[PDB]
């Protein structure tokens, strides 16, 4: 009956907890207590990208590590030339409430989405000189929080309907759906593209197999909503920022939480997380108007980016690791080295 | 210094800047409103009778109207989950939140008060005023006059309540309905004035289904909100 099913679920959860606990051979902090600290990373702003009318929620670096796409709640995506600050493209949006943007790996497409529950793919390289809406993907029953491109024809999206979805582009239909008991806020794609991890408003991050379509693993530990998520460049680890003012690094193989990054002087939630190219530096944007650069192996705050007069909403590190670009609610993007 | 193609790219960026300035001239002069309420609340009727006078799973509905040559954009939410904690953060810069409450339903009035308390005390709406539309006043009047259900059965503080002296009863309407509607308004305003300091203010309004003045009250309240924002910004207080 229902009681029997509940008891079986409780027993399985206890078994999973015991199995995870029976593998804590040596904590990551204890092992890395011997490695040298990275020291104070005095990152400095080099270019200020301005021209957004309102606050920015999403930014994405191109594969070329030179072209940016930034989504602001003025109904606009802007494709920036990071090197020259020139505005390559200005795409008006038919829905002003945008929470995510994605720049296609090929550079041919950009993605946007928000409270209109539609993932809009815009074609950049057309015979006509204008950027045109390649198509609109509908089917989510909640706000679209993150979208990412597997390729020019597949896109994975996360919504507030406690659901992620992998979409085909030529046929705008959900190729598969991924079913979390709260709003899903962030997505991150593994470098192999065969998996993706999604954090939701239930203090739970789930690693999903893209092809099969079922939840491969689940990770708990946070005390509040998960707002940002990213992969370690290895593809076998991922870091989550949350409203409980903590970041947490998990490993899929260990199937348990590895390490936590927190300080008593910060009480604001993390809104955007990213990794440096090596994975040694974990950059996390906060509501305290700052972007804290942590040492991913020592949990020591190694740097602070303080150039924004409003909350840091989006943050991203280039493919080559040269620069880190963070966009805030003060209508500005800042590029740091 | 710059190659010819580089200068032409700079020129393209300058034209993009010019278009962005033209769009800023419109964004600055356009006021964004967030419509909130419940299924019982006639916010759909307000939207209909305010769009007339001035996609299946789509989560946002934008109603654009204009009063005294100033533009307003209400944004109703219609395809999102019962949770509100996150997408509400998208509206930290809106001019006002229009909160529509069905004053007739005594059973769900406490739910409306709790929802208004959640909106008022939210961290990201600490500087955002609420235009409170106590809709369905005619139904409340009919219910109180033809008295079968009593507020005292739901709020055990209606007996020890008197109509405030600073009241503006409509012509030819009984003191009982005035007492009821001002009690509801006083519950909402008590929640409003319990906290928030002076950053944001709740504007109460007794509205009906077919009222044609709702756009006018939104315009007046938004004018007051922008006045307060300018008093703060231009260093007058």
């Amino acid at each position, epitope marked *: 009956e229902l009681d029997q099913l509940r008891q079986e679920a409780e027993q399985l959860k206890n078994q999973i907890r015991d199995a995870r606990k029976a593998c804590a051979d040596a904590t990551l902090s204890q092992i890395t207590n011997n490695i040298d600290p990275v020291g104070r990373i005095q990152m400095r702003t080099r270019r200020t990208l301005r021209g957004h009318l309102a606050k920015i929620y999403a930014m994405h670096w191109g594969t070329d590590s030179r072209l940016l796409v930034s989504a602001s709640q003025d109904g606009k995506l802007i494709i920036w030339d990071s090197y020259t600050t020139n505005k390559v493209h200005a795409i008006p949006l038919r829905s002003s409430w945008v929470m995510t943007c994605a720049y296609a790996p090929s550079g041919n497409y950009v993605a946007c989405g928000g409270l209109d529950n539609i993932c809009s793919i815009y074609n950049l390289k057309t015979r006509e000189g204008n950027v045109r809406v390649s198509r609109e993907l509908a089917g989510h029953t909640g706000y679209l929080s993150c979208c990412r491109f597997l390729d020019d024809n597949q896109i994975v999206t996360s919504s507030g309907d406690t659901t992620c979805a992998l979409w085909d582009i030529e046929t705008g239909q959900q190729t598969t759906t991924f079913t979390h008991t709260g709003d899903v806020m962030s997505l991150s794609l593994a470098p192999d593209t065969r998996l993706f991890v999604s954090g939701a408003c239930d203090a739970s991050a789930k690693l999903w197999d893209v092809r099969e379509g079922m939840c491969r693993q689940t990770f708990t530990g946070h005390e509040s909503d998960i707002n940002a998520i990213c992969f370690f460049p290895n593809g076998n680890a991922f870091a989550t920022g949350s409203d409980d003012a903590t970041c947490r690094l998990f490993d899929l193989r260990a199937d348990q939480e590895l390490m936590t990054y927190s300080h008593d002087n910060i009480i604001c939630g993390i809104t955007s997380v990213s990794f440096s190219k090596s994975g040694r530096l974990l950059l996390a944007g906060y509501d305290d108007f700052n972007c804290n650069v942590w040492d991913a192996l020592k949990a020591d705050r190694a740097g602070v980016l303080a150039g924004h007069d409003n909350r840091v909403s989006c943050l991203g590190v280039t493919d080559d690791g040269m620069a880190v670009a963070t966009g805030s609610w003060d209508s500005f993007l800042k590029i740091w080295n | 210094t710059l190659s*010819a193609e580089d200068k032409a790219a700079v020129e393209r960026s300058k034209m993009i800047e010019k278009q962005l300035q033209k769009d800023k001239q419109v964004y600055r002069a356009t006021h964004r409103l967030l419509l909130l309420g419940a299924d019982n609340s006639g916010k759909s009727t307000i939207v209909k009778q305010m769009r007339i006078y001035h996609v299946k799973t789509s989560g946002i509905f934008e109603t654009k109207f204009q009063v005294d040559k100033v533009n307003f954009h209400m944004f109703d939410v219609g395809a999102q989950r019962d949770e509100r904690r996150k997408w509400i953060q998208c509206f930290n810069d809106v001019t006002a939140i229009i909160f529509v409450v069905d004053s007739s339903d005594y059973n769900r009035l406490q739910e409306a008060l709790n929802d208004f308390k959640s909106i008022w005390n939210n961290r990201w709406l600490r500087t955002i005023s609420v235009i409170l539309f106590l809709n369905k006043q005619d139904l409340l009047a009919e219910k109180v006059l033809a008295g079968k259900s009593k507020i005292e059965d739901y709020f055990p503080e209606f007996a020890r309540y008197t109509t405030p002296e600073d009241a503006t009863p409509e012509p030819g309407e009984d003191p009982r309905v005035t007492r009821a509607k001002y009690f509801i308004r006083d519950e909402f305003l008590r929640i409003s004035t319990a906290s928030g300091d002076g950053r944001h203010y709740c504007y109460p309004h007794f509205t009906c289904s077919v009222d044609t003045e709702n756009a006018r009250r939104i315009f007046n309240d938004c004018r007051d909100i922008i006045q307060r924002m300018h008093l703060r910004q231009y260093e007058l207080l």
Partner: single-chain antibody
Amino acid sequence: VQLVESGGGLVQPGGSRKLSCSASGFAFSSFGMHWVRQAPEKGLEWVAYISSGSGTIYYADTVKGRFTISRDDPKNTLFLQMTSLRSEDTAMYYCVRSIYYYGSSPFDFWGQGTTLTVSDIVMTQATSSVPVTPGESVSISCRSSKSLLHSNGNTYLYWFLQRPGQSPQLLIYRMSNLASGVPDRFSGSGSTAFTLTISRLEAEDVGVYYCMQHLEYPLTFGAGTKLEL
């Protein structure tokens, strides 16, 4: 994308004539426009350029002052008004579409040309004719008087193919980048000295190959390398 041109013919020397260009099928307002002349048997020569927003207008030294360029974005029509016509101005005039942003392909689309008959970095193409047979691989070389590699890392060399009785078609922009719609057979490389390599040649690649610089105005072409079967 279509660029039709009109307004040419027989005109007595010393007169005037206006050339019009109707653009249909693309965002004309966001594209810069070029007028490029070609004498009846000689090569291509850049005449004028108008920028998006009409804020940057350049003329060749041989047409400056007596020619003026203009555009009408709402009507999507380019204009070249010419005064004091001379015997040198007997050519097919071409409208050229060129957008300028990072990664863009300038000179992507050429029009059809209008015949008008009246009654500076140097591009050298030391080879004017090449005997070729289908199936082989040929390389067309150009030389420049000044280095076209700018400090930004771009070598601003362009390649065009003019098939018999047809407008020039972009093949390679910036000396390495393939245009859209050209087969992967074409490939270009270089440094002051450049080359265009065609592999597994087909019968549709016969014509005259022109190399054009874009480092600084005036835009100067080469003589052209004719490939005949």
